[PDB]
From a paper:
Of special interest is PI3K alpha (PI3Kα), a heterodimer of p110α and p85α. Cancer-specific mutations in p110α, such as H1047R, result in constitutive PI3Kα signaling, contributing to tumorigenesis by sustaining aberrant AKT-mTOR pathway. For example, the small-molecule activator UCL-TRO-1938 (referred to as 1938 hereafter) selectively enhances PI3Kα activity, demonstrating cardioprotection against ischemia-reperfusion injury and promoting nerve regeneration in preclinical models. Here, we present cryo-electron microscopy (cryo-EM) structures of wild-type (WT) PI3Kα in complex with the activator 1938, the unliganded PI3Kα H1047R mutant, and the PI3Kα H1047R mutant in complex with 1938 at resolutions of 3.17 Å, 3.09 Å, and 2.94 Å, respectively.
Numbering used by the authors:
A (entry chain A): 18 to 234, 246 to 310, 323 to 500, 524 to 863, 873 to 943, 950 to 1050
B (entry chain B): 326 to 414, 421 to 429, 441 to 585
Write the structure that this text describes.
Amino acid sequence: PRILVECLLPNGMIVTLECLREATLITIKHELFKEARKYPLHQLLQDESSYIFVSVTQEAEREEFFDETRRLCDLRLFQPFLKVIEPVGNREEKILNREIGFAIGMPVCEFDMVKDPEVQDFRRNILNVCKEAVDLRDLNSPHSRAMYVYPPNVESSPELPKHIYNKLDKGQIIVVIWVIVSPNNDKQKYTLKINHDCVPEQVIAEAIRKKTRSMLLYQGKYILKVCGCDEYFLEKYPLSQYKYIRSCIMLGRMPNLMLMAKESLYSQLPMDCFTMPSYSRRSTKSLWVINSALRIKILCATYVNVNIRDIDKIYVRTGIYHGGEPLCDNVNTQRVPCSNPRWNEWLNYDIYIPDLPRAARLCLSICSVKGRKGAKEEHCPLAWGNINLFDYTDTLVSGKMALNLWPVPHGLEDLLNPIGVTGSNPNKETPCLELEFDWFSSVVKFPDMSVIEEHANWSVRENDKEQLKAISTRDPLSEITEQEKDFLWSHRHYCVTIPEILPKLLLSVKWNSRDEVAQMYCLVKDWPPIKPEQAMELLDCNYPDPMVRGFAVRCLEKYLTDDKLSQYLIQLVQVLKYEQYLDNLLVRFLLKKALTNQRIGHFFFWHLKSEMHNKTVSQRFGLLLESYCRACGMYLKHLNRQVEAMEKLINLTDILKQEKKDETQKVQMKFLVEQMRRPDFMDALQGFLSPLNPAHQLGNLRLEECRIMSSAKRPLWLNWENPDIMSELLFQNNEIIFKNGDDLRQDMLTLQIIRIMENIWQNQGLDLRMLPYGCLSIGDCVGLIEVVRNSHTIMQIQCKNSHTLHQWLKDKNKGEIYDAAIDLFTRSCAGYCVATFILGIGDRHNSNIMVKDDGQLFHIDFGHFLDHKKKERVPFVLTQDFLIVISKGAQECTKTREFERFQEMCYKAYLAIRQHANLFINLFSMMLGSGMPELQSFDDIAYIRKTLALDKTEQEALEYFMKQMNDARHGG
Amino acid sequence: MSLQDAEWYWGDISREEVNEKLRDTADGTFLVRDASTKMHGDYTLTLRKGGNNKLIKIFHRDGKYGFSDPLTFSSVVELINHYRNESLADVKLLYPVSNIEAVGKKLHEYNTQFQEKSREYDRLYEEYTRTSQEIQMKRTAIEAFNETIKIFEEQCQTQERYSKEYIEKFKREGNEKEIQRIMHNYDKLKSRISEIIDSRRRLEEDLKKQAAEYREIDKRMNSIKPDLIQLRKTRDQYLMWLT
């Protein structure tokens, strides 16, 4: 339909243009000049090709469409107007910037308006990382590009676990090699029985001999692909090492692999080229020499949102922190009435100036005073804000400053918030605060590393060994007494032989001293490297020193492999928020990983893009996103489609949220169908990769299968036909639930932890079957969750006494499948009871638990991963139905040997979790500033130490868990 | 002096209530509690110095207590009093933490009103978030109006310019073209720019009103919060009696 576009000719006369809502830009331009031919002063106008369009978007920014074939709806222009001017920029540059801006969600020009020098230095200097990654991508093309786009999905363990080794017959796996090399697709099948240790080239050669229906002896001209998805075997690894082959071995499934030609894949992959963007072009005294105390002038607060009558007086809390350690006591200003927040006071601190560590962070807060409730006046922060006392170039901050104050985080009653972000609130309607810092007649900066080396060497048995070994094995959250700290500091030169002691010895040092920290720096310089599961802790709130995190990052560089990196990626993305500057070593590590492995890049992008809606890290993650999109290669277009699809979905649910809140199920369904039938919706929602898994493509939607649930949430079911020709081998339909209104980062954390529990149980020698199904959060209360096939809730199974579930399992597994079904049910139940107890998940009714037809059992929804209640708390008590299924329907469920082996597996699982509890502690401690209500305030993380009984010995924990189980079911 | 009656001894394995009690308290405040390692005989001591809760372990051997071997004190109370009189050298011990129907009804009422204030605080927080989102979208719309006004402004400037000159009198080609179409075209142009500037102005006024509402919501939330913390503390300290 016509929208009466107002066109702005170079002369200036407005043109009333009528065009269809779906119209190409060039057609509108041609029609505009055709109409201007009727308009006066047409002779002044130049040729059509020379000019170009300009419009203002709803994002309050202007864009000049250099080469746009998009529709009017795709232009998303704020007002129906179209300026015509002579273009001046570059076509490729502007189109790339538009693409990056649509991927991030905010225009790239806003990052240019930001005049903060650290932002510009970051943007100019991270391009070295981008370019080096791109150059690495092109070292051995098209092989290197093939590795980039399709990376090997391999385990880090080449040596097979003994249980799945026994699952294989003599270590021989039978694989169905499908070859479609023919004038028409006919699906030639060759059955192979080969050892699991054979490299892909041996599979290729032996399958070639099989296809020769004799033994011919092609050579270097063939590769393998997983049937039903875009997974490929290009790297010389044991065939078992790939996750598809291990999954087939463990689940007893038949592995199907297509044999394909290298040239088809090589043609499928376009070239990746990176070009420098436009922004690629644009007295000091040592801190130790200054002899004075820290002293900062609090000038005034512009305004605070506190009642004059309700609240009598306000003051400002301050501090000098280093991580979470106050380097000295807090100072206050004298209380003033709320009307006139003027202090103008030189607050002074016990900390000596050279005694300042490189990571000091002078936290603030505007706080209230109220004596009506009691003599001890209650103090609550009206607002807060942090300042790094050093600049990105090592210089101590001087002069005046103005800080906007963030609101207090919900549920945080501590006056200061030294966990929060170190910068001003971008909003300028917030309360501000003027400060001013000491001037030393010169710019003063932290000493270089060589001076710290020079300071040392001048500033500085069996029972000891046993105590050191006992300390090293202790929990990271284990309380350390001062005697232990003095012992740790005394024998540091012997603590270096025990490299597991670095996270402990670090908390032994007083960062106040200038003498101790030089010695600690030398120690970290010569510290032997440690395992990446322990060097990850050194990247958290409590270890903010540059040398500490440099050591941790170089250890991950030497030892972290891409299998685990994809697993601990959420934690590292969240630990980015704990870094002090913009351009650090962790961000370069993560970027160089995401720019050499599209598996890492896809989820890196989606995690950051999810965390773009928080204003505290929106700027950091936006700069990171724009750098990635500069050098992400050809995947960006795909990402856009995903984003486009997601946007449409969110929009639909938005119309469901308010317009369709009060209408019934049938009318909401018919309106949903009407919204689906729109051709733009079909174009956006089909033909793109998946956010949950890049390897699985989504195809044409199935409008009949897509439907809106009748549950209270009302999410959406979306079904996609698989584009791959081998749709039957893997799965016909990809089904996903889109939820708009539920936080799904807690669910991601729970499912991840379930995955590591399953991995350690399998590695030990225990086969407890878990379902860590895919989950993704891409925004605020926006998420995608996978669908599990042939699964029904306990309520659904029971509806369709105590024997109903076992009767259903018998009907679905009558025959020889009975015993294997019962065994899988027992092992799945053991694993999930252990996991839900240890993590203390919420109340699990029937709807929370589902059972497949195979026999597996699993839990679907989460949200209390540390018992968000006040504070033990066995949520999942074994229902009598569960016991009946465990012991094969015997009435005396407790008095069976099946129940004895069930309990023994539970005990072994509990111990298995307890030896690795350090990993769970670290992974939970990396999620403190995430904003999840459940995982702030270490009082929450101490739940995972209460349910794992870390202070006691394994025998006390054994007795505690036995008592917990005995109470739970209580005979059913 | 016997233990189990001293002020500093609190008892069980709470472990974190010590952090709450010692936080935001004067330097030298201390606590002694037996937990976190073994059933009895641990007796750790939390001393607040430099804003930090230092932990000191009380070793027990041969019926004697003491911070480090050799142990010269008899009971916990003797050690506590001896280090209250004399410094640890690093600060001597300064500040020790210390009908049925009526108290039961008071506790029940406090729980009920705590629930009331918690729900009120949640409603205030959700209103705060909604108003913040409205403020951000209104600021974006104001910036969009600013850009549109600017672009229409140089469009209008270019129009008048060319028009005024190219078409001035009968001597030019425009004998009556100006009156015929072009003055009306410029009239529509100025009407459009006036409409857009009026929309920008009224939306700035709406944004100012929304900002005032935001300020009021923040004031109400910030006044109601500390009362909520005080009521939570009172409810906790009556529940600690549980008798």
